[PDB]
Design a protein around this ligand. Structure first.
Ligand SMILES: [Fe+2]
Ligand SMILES: [Fe+2]
Lengths: 404, 399
């Protein structure tokens, strides 16, 4: 509920590869890294419980199904394989509770989202995180990733991004827990990595963009994709994510840091903004907001025999829902039948979850957080009729239950 | 151009099960009305039920691809010919909604589950081919929180004016499917309210706006938990004229109330299509004047879908093993055009960019073949690597 500030950093895979190759000493990379140093230190001094981390995925975990604002509600996240094998980094913790509250506040504000769990984080996240946070063992904070689909046009308008960040700030502030949150916008600055125009940069624009983002960001809310792409290269237009981050911070900020290095394709830039706190008192109170978000499911617990599928539920049943969901894969459900045990022993499912499947325990699976449709798959596969599943739910014999 | 109205219906999978009865008879007036008006495209609002949409689960997933085959739900591919999509239409829809500040997702290639195909089979003749084209909208009503009722309404409202801005003479049927009232899970599995059912099917048509305050708690208490999915009817409803029912239905053979509604478009605005087509085009207008740049818009996503999808697989360890050691076998098993295989065989970087491969797939390929991004960029610029590095402030390599 305390926003301490935000930072902005390029996320080019070259940062990661300079890190993994220990080019910290390298004549070329040494000074780049030194540019990371004040952000690294601030983060180490300020000790945020959570970083709300805005990035875009590069056709790795998001491709055949591609969304604008995909909020990560998961328990942990590991490096995505981008074709060369997973980088060697421990997994980093998510924050389902913060993510839930944020989703609720953002939906209330008529932002349409996507939720996701379990998928790799690509260079968009881990490239700069690996240089800004000690990871030799685990990570110093949790993360709530927000993947933004800036690659497949049409994409949301720059002003839409800013507005998301304006709602995001109130979402986090109203989070009724006493923690520190930092916000990260990532990507940029100028570059283009495709076409005969590959190699384009524009330091003049990068320098102008950073200054305006710091001191007059509402001035940018009119730029089209064409304006951004002309000035900052095609892929440089991803800087709408910095806009998002900046929107979440106070109207006015202190810029503690700025650095810029253009060694090859990408202008590798970082900024660190210290929140100044709400200039005014806020329009809607942390109380009216929390209730506004709580609204759509107000009273729902009065409904009995009923286990609503909320993020918390989805997160709690993920391991076993993911498992049961694979029953659409032919060799999988075939293994599910002929050799259920070696498959169980193949899984990350707990003994409890395995027990629930073996026991074909239907109402306890719903209890535990399995969504019905995954039972619908299991039942379909085992030759059980749906009716039997509703019989076992109701605690009745099929004929007993068939009273209608 | 214009819309012919739109039908409402249950996507219950029993409607599918059954086909291998004043119920199939409930589908008649629809079934004929589909041949009558003869729709160019059907805009189909449904929800996937944790089959194709699970680990990444979005609110409004617009199908942009060219065709759709039935999803394996654990029981196997349901023998059915693919149905065609409308990428051009879908693009425009995307453009117009985004300008309206609706946040979307785009998807191609994934199967369609019973929530789509069950009804379509008893709705339109599949024997040989489908009688129209589809633009699916898959709404995440299963994982909470979900968009507000009013929200679903307004998306419908924009959908209308979007579809009315499409530069064509074509007629569109706007489907919207689900429910009606039921709960498929829990001790309270089996719940029903037909009194609520009728109050709903009736309030939708005559007094749609009056539903726009209902919450998830209300929809669940009255219609059962899964019954709340009926907000997908509101969305459908929003896409039509402010104000005739050509048919209705009902019966309760099992858990799910099976309802139908056949609406005829009676016509209506505040922004001229000269202003609306231009406003949609605004974000990317002028962009053709930026040389050496191939924006990745949906038309491009669709044209390059097969080969993007293929190179995408390079993230799987085994696939990229095959790619290196035995590429020809891989091509043979693929759905690639020989043109596409050629681009890949030729390691023709600029060509793939021109053809619609997105760079990040090329990045995967390059790395897999043990070659750097730099070799790729250099190739883009028709330069040798050292000559490309002359343009960099500092030369470096990496994959
Ligand atoms: Fe990026
Ligand atoms: Fe459904």
């Amino acid at each position: 509920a305390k926003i301490i500030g935000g930072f902005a950093v390029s996320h080019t895979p070259t940062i990661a590869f300079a890190h993994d190759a220990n080019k910290y000493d390298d004549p070329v990379w040494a000074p780049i890294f030194q540019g990371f140093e004040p952000v690294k230190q601030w983060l180490a001094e300020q000790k945020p419980d959570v970083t709300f981390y805005v990035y875009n995925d590069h056709m790795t975990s998001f491709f055949e199904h591609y969304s604008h604002f995909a909020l990560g509600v998961g328990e942990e996240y590991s490096p995505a394989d981008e074709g060369g094998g997973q980088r060697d980094l421990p997994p980093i913790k998510g924050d389902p509770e913060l993510a839930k509250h944020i989703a609720e506040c953002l939906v209330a504000d008529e932002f349409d989202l996507a939720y996701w769990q379990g998928m790799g984080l690509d260079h968009g996240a881990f490239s700069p995180l690996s240089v800004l946070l000690p990871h030799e063992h685990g990570w110093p904070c949790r993360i709530v990733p927000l993947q933004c689909g800036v690659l497949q046009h049409p994409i949301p308008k720059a002003r839409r991004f800013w507005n998301f960040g304006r709602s995001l700030r109130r979402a986090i502030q109203s989070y009724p827990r006493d923690i520190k949150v930092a916000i990260a916008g990532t990507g940029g600055l100028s570059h283009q990595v495709h076409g005969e125009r590959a190699g384009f940069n524009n330091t003049e624009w990068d320098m102008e963009f950073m200054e305006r983002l710091a001191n007059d960001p509402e001035s940018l809310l009119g730029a089209t994709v064409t304006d951004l792409a002309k000035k900052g290269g095609w892929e440089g237009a991803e800087v709408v994510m910095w806009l998002l981050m900046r929107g979440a911070l106070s109207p006015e900020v202190k810029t503690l840091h700025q650095s810029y290095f253009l060694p090859s394709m990408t202008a590798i830039a970082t900024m660190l903004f210290e929140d100044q706190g709400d200039a005014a008192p806020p329009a809607e109170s942390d109380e009216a907001l929390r209730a506004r978000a709580k609204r759509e499911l107000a009273g729902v617990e009065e409904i009995e025999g009923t286990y609503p599928f909320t993020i918390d539920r989805a997160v709690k049943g993920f391991r076993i829902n993911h498992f049961l969901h694979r029953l659409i894969e032919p060799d999988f459900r075939k293994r599910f039948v002929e050799d259920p045990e070696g498959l169980f022993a193949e899984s990350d499912l707990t003994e409890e979850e395995k027990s629930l499947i073996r026991n074909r325990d239907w109402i306890g699976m719903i209890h535990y957080g399995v969504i019905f449709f995954m039972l619908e798959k299991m039942a379909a596969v085992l030759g059980i009729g749906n009716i039997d599943v509703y019989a076992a739910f109701r605690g009745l014999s099929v004929p007993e239950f068939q009273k209608t």
